[PDB]
């Protein structure tokens, strides 16, 4: 009995609402999307939040489908490096100095974020299960400066430690092309440090001490990993509680596959990053799907796939259809097949280990 837990479902993405390049092509089909995923053994998924507004959208979307989704949906709350300007070329570069000069607005935004996390963490049965996406993305300095990324990654890490309930939440971390700086910031929280200055006045919102340290059981999930073998070793050595998320983007080249082979199997989590990270014929991963198609009775794609302008007419019918170019959580099974072949770990074995590990982290 196979079970998948997609830790990277971008369910708020406009493509899942029928919008492509800013144009609506079909009615939103996310309930049918969830039905497709359930049919392909996806039991649970974590819906990503990337800003205060997007986290609020995720809260509301998950609530809106609680009685319609055959998947159990959880979500994150956090502000991604894309979006840290909401706490605050010429404009982006100017912001850090302006925040330091007058931190009052940022102080209020950090309070708003803390308050949201606490509100959502309240109920015993809450769908809010992880703080993130937070981290660093040095491929996106056109969205935010390095200084703004580093400061607001760190302030969010502090918030995630501010009380006992949040301190236990696993972190859903973003890292792209920023390994050394990402490790440098996290290492201070792994070992512990004292924030005397408290520029953003967080200690006004569990201890007067100013001492920040991750709980020894807090899990640290590095989403959508595509780094080098050297980067991987830096992450694994940071903490035994570092986990590595693997999706189709993590499997594109032979180098990527070699790196994935080195991830300890019990520290590997599976995700689609849907609607992104489709496993394509031009990827080194495809050969394993080809093998499964040929020798193992595997259906690729999992359901008929049509162009975006052809989906709408299919939506009254009972049969389920995908959109060409739009990845989905029902493609978890493809990631699992590839990882199992790359690692020479029996497929059912891999699925079982990843399922149990993911459930322990997120619930």
Q: Which residues are annotated as a binding site?
A: 133, 223, 273
- Stretch of 85-93, 123-131, 212-220, 222-230 contacting Mg ion, by CB under 5 A: 222-230
Does 247 help bind Mg ion (rule: CB under 5 A)?
A: no
CB closer to Mg ion, 69 vs 250: 250
Instruction: Give min distance, CB of 275 to Mg ion, in A.
Output: 10
- DSSP-derived pairing of the beta strands 4-9 and 42-47: parallel
297: left (phi over 0), alpha (psi -120 to 50) or beta: left
Dihedral pair phi/psi, residue 169, rounded to 5° = -65, 135
Tell me the number of residues near Mg ion by CB under 5 A. 2
51 neighbors 86 (Cβ within 8 angstroms): yes
Single out the residue of 71, 84, 75, 61 nearest to residue 14, CA to CA: 61
CB closer to Mg ion, 231 vs 273: 273
CB closer to Mg ion, 69 vs 224: 224
One DSSP character per residue, 291-318 reads HHHHHS---SSSSEEE-GGGSGGGTTSS
71 neighbors 38 (Cβ within 8 angstroms): yes
Dihedral pair phi/psi, residue 133, rounded to 5° = -75, 120
- Stretch of 74-82, 98-106, 161-169, 217-225 contacting Mg ion, by CB under 5 A: 217-225
Does 224 help bind Mg ion (rule: CB under 5 A)?
A: yes
Instruction: Give min distance, CB of 106 to Mg ion, in A.
Output: 25
Q: Residues in the chain, how many? A: 363
Instruction: Give min distance, CB of 223 to Mg ion, in A.
Output: 6
Other Cβ atoms within 10 Å of 46 Cβ, number: 30
- Stretch of 17-25, 99-107, 238-246, 271-279 contacting Mg ion, by CB under 5 A: 271-279
Instruction: Give min distance, CB of 312 to Mg ion, in A.
Output: 27
49 neighbors 133 (Cβ within 8 angstroms): yes
Does 273 help bind Mg ion (rule: CB under 5 A)?
A: yes
Instruction: Give min distance, CB of 221 to Mg ion, in A.
Output: 12
Residue that has been written with the tokens 């049919």 in this structure: 39
- Stretch of 20-28, 68-76, 164-172, 223-231 contacting Mg ion, by CB under 5 A: 223-231
Task: Using CB under 5 A, list all residues that contact Mg ion.
Answer: 224, 273
């Amino acid at each position: 009995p196979l079970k998948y837990y997609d830790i990277g479902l971008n369910l708020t993405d406009p493509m899942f609402h029928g919008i492509y390049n800013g144009k609506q092509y079909h009615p939103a089909d996310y309930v049918k999307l969830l039905e497709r995923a359930a049919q392909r053994h996806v039991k649970n998924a974590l819906v990503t939040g990337s800003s205060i507004a997007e986290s609020q959208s995720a809260i509301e979307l998950v609530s809106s489908v609680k009685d319609l989704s055959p998947l159990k949906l959880y979500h994150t709350i956090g502000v991604h490096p894309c979006c840290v300007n909401e706490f605050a070329e010429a404009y982006n570069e100017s912001l850090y100095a302006k925040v330091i000069s007058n931190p009052s607005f940022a102080q209020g935004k950090l309070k708003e974020l803390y308050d949201l996390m606490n509100q959502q963490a309240k109920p015993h049965d809450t769908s809010f299960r992880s703080i993130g996406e937070i981290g660093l993305d040095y491929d996106r300095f056109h969205y935010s400066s390095k200084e703004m990324q580093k400061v607001f990654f760190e302030e969010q890490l502090k918030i995630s430690c501010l009380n006992d309930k949040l301190s236990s939440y696993p972190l859903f971390l973003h890292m792209r092309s920023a390994c050394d700086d990402f490790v440098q910031i996290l290492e201070r929280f792994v070992v512990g440090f004292t924030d005397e200055k408290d520029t953003f006045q967080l200690q006004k919102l569990s201890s007067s001490s100013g001492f920040y340290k991750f709980h020894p059981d807090r899990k640290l999930v590095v989403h959508s990993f595509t780094g080098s073998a050297i980067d991987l070793q830096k992450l694994l050595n940071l903490s035994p509680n570092i986990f590595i998320g693997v999706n189709g983007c993590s499997l594109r080249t032979e180098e990527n596959l070699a790196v994935v082979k080195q991830i300890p199997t019990e520290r590997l989590l599976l995700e689609t990053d849907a609607p992104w990270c489709e496993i394509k014929r031009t990827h080194a991963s495809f050969q394993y799907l080809a093998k499964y198609q040929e020798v193992r009775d595997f259906e690729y794609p999992a359901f008929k796939s049509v162009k975006k302008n052809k989906l709408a007419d299919k939506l009254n019918a009972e049969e389920l259809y995908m959109v060409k170019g739009r990845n989905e959580p029902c493609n978890m099974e493809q990631v699992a097949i590839v990882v199992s072949e790359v690692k020479d770990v029996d497929l059912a074995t891999l699925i079982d280990t990843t399922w149990k590990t993911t459930c322990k982290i997120f619930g």
